[PDB]
């Protein structure tokens, strides 16, 4: 073997998880790190945030693979096909993957938190500034990356998410991938685009500070099936000890000097 006794790289274990990380990447207690507590009230209503742009119809996805940490739906990021535009951002950001985070159980799972309420679950759509290139220059850079995180309640189904839901079993453990071409990221958009935005970093490790975080208002509703079958992925390796992957998430970490804008009042 169990990784606890082999190697002690990041996770979300005991032994491994994010009250560990700072060893290794000591910007975990940097200034700008996420995520965070939206406290709705007082965070601030901003005239100049544009509408957000989201132009997912050009979209080409291409394979899921479990990391060991979460699954990754990967896209072509070798073209404007699926841009992230407006909003706070002065740029155009490419879509490069999409992946999830969630809990042991439904009243856990979301790293933001909203007046410390927590989700069952939160998607992030990772998108990097066309000016940088490709991805690994944009992580150098203070606004390489818009990240638009999306919340996850139990209700009713996702239809968008059901392809998701599919094709887990093929992808059970860690390092497995499989075909995901012809998966449309629209599906898994709320009504609304109202948003709340502040700058923060990646919420795994190496934690960088780059992100321009965009969390919707509105969640969607997943069914208790949907996300049952998330906790049935393994973090590790075949051949090796299951251990489910559950808890998959950074909690909230400190404001310091920022102020939560939002888009809407
Ligand atoms: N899980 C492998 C493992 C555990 C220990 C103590 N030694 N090994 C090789
Ligand atoms: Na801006
Ligand atoms: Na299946
Ligand atoms: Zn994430």
């Keep these: 073997g169990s990784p606890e006794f082999m190697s002690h790289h990041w996770g979300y274990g005991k032994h491994n998880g994010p009250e560990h990380w700072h060893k290794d990447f000591p ?9 965070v507590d939206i406290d709705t009230h007082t965070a601030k209503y901003d005239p100049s945030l544009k509408p957000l742009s989201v132009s997912y119809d050009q979209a080409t996805s291409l394979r899921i693979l479990n990391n060991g940490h979460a699954f990754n739906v990967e896209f072509d990021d070798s073209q404007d096909k699926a841009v992230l535009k407006g909003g706070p951002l002065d740029g155009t950001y490419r879509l490069i993957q999409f992946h999830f985070h969630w809990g042991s159980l439904d009243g856990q799972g979301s790293e933001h938190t909203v007046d410390k309420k927590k989700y069952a679950a939160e998607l992030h759509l990772v998108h990097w500034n066309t000016k940088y290139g490709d991805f690994g220059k944009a992580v150098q850079q203070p606004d390489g990356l818009a990240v638009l995180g999306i919340f996850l309640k139990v209700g009713s189904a996702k239809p968008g998410l059901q392809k998701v839901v599919d094709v887990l079993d093929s992808i059970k453990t860690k390092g497995k991938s499989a075909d995901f ?14 948003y709340w935005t502040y700058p923060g970093s990646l919420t795994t490790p190496p934690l960088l500070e780059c992100v321009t975080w965009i969390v919707l208002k509105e969640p969607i509703s997943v069914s208790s099936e949907q996300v049952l079958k998330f906790r049935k992925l393994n973090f590790n390796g075949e051949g090796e000890p299951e251990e489910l992957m559950v808890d998959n998430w950074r909690p909230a970490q400190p404001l310091k000097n920022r102020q939560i804008k939002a888009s809407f009042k």
């Design 27 to 35: 910007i975990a207690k940097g200034e700008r790190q996420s995520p």
């Design 181 to 194: 071409t012809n998966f449309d990221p629209r599906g898994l958009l709320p009504e609304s685009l109202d």
